[model samples]
Target: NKLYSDIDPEMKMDWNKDVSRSLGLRSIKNSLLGIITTRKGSRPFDPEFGCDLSDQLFENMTPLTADTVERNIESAVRNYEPRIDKLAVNVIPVYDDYTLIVEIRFSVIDNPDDIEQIKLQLASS
Candidate 1:
């Protein structure tokens, strides 16, 4: 889904500050971020449309927790995004820390060779 630049989180935007519309790869990626961050039940009617990553965020940080993050992320993207033909998710944790560095590698079915990368926030301990 492409994100419209017409509005903000709660209301309309000022013409000078807001973009009217956007399309293509950048917009697609922006929308993807929304999907990955939003919890599962936050989506109205279609309650299963998000990462729900928060559930695992506050848990005790450990090797096990890091592994869980990787697994859940891969599963969520593969299951929900049918358009991605190639997907690679690497979750690396900081030494003795709860924060993570996630690298999501993907290519849409429509453009396989035009692979893209979304390097998330760095890992922290």
Candidate 2:
């Protein structure tokens, strides 16, 4: 939303007209979410766009490793994306819970002092 995405101080709502201008954290969060959700080649024109990071999650058969998961995230986010300074990924396989949790910890290049975490919980379909 050109103006709709704005946060109104009195009562912040997505439909409200925006006045303040900001970036950094919101930009980083949005970009990371986009990268994590999308799979490569899902886009028509930008075939190389998206991430294979969660592809293995759906596969549900491949063996996982912190090294592999970290590698997967590192390549896509750390190597592919330019916004992050560095990223660390941790995968926890909960067989009993039927869920695989991916924890992505990262620091934006602009704000190296802050550490952010993005958690993705994948459950069997």
Candidate 3:
């Protein structure tokens, strides 16, 4: 069964945004973030089986269009940071949705407390 297959078509965008926000995602730049469908019988793969298929999809999936890439870069710069030297993003198609995997390969400076701070902020909010 597909997770998002039966979701209200009109609510898909808002639903996606809610999912992203729940994951502590601040911004989605262009098509840098999106959802795609997965194969049947994949419903239990995410949490129950702890499948790595999602990661595999993320690594191999290609941008569907040049426009997507262009728009994504613009959004990234405008919403997240003007500098894009330290971050990377990937997307994986799932069972009726897509997952965005982001990586911050480098940091401006080492601040061990930042993680805790973020956690605290989320908790309080």
Candidate 4:
């Protein structure tokens, strides 16, 4: 029961050289990651498509900063993706490394029993 699918962001080629595909849980997770990373107004067509966390990367890493990041992520996901429910976003500031650890948790719309979690570290590389 594959309810969701998306093209791989890397645009990798399959065995036959066709574009690789992300399916089911993998597909939804990929899109979520994309939403979190993209900067608002960077997308030419839809200026409201992504979270604006990139703008805060240079700010002082503090608990308040983490809250702001978390809010941006939560709103973006709620507005952009419809395949998941019970979405929760948490941003933890790691002052030692000057990084924000983004943690996202949600359940597939029809499969509420299974919770999916993704953790990403954001910092200027």
Which has the greatest TM-score?
Answer: 4
Ranking by TM-score: 4, 1, 2, 3
User: How would you encode candidate 3's per-residue C-alpha lDDT over 57-86 as one tens digit per residue?
Assistant: 444445652234333533443443432233
Q: What residue pairs are clashing in model 4?
A: none
TM-score of 4: 0.75
- Poorest 10 consecutive residues of model 2 by lDDT? 14-23
Q: How big is the positional error of residue 68 in model 1, measured in Å on the Cα after superposition?
A: 1.6
Q: Which residue ranges in model 1 land beyond 4 Å of their true spot?
A: 1-23, 95-97, 122-125
Which candidate model has the greater lDDT, 2 or 3?
A: 2
Task: Let me know the TM-score candidate 3 reaches against the reference structure.
Answer: 0.23
TM per model? 0.65, 0.64, 0.23, 0.75
The clash tally of candidate 3 reads 8
Candidate 2 matches the true fold with a TM-score of 0.64
Best model per lDDT:
4
Segments of candidate 4 deviating more than 4 angstroms: 1-22
Query: Candidate 2, which segments miss by more than 4 Å at Cα?
Result: 1-22, 53-59, 62-66, 96-98, 123-125
CA lDDT of every candidate:
0.67, 0.66, 0.32, 0.78
Candidate 4 CA-lDDT value: 0.78
- How displaced is residue 52 in candidate 3, in Å? 27
